[PDB]
Amino acid sequence: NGDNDCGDFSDEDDCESEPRPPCRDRVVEESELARTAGYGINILGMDPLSTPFDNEFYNGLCNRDRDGNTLTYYRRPWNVASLIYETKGEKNFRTEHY
């Protein structure tokens, strides 16, 4: 049913019924975005590491993520509970003289 979990076509290897699509609307895959939400940061080490878990598998009906800079629809995997696209921005400055 278009649910890729193990490999490229490991689960979809045997298709007896018709290839029923799970979602009909055009939703672009999460390319280079928070899709890779797993991180192995070391409190004693350095910057976060790669993802420790699978973040591509999804359970059922695609949960729409209709947000972002441009007009495009992303997917949120079943492993990621939330995906916000807030473009927050701030800065601070200070000075002193003795």
């Binding site: 359970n59 059922g60 009906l61 949960n63 079943w78 509970a81």
Partner: protein, 49 residues
Amino acid sequence: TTTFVDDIKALPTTYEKGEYFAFLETYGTHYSSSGSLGGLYELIYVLDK
């Protein structure tokens, strides 16, 4: 949604603070009854002599 309903369906009933604290971070503590889409900006400056 089917994801949240399945979480409430597969949910304990004997005051499991461990999972409830875990479930609390998954969907937040309290939802928004009314919001306001848009955006705001602010600027703050200080000076002392």
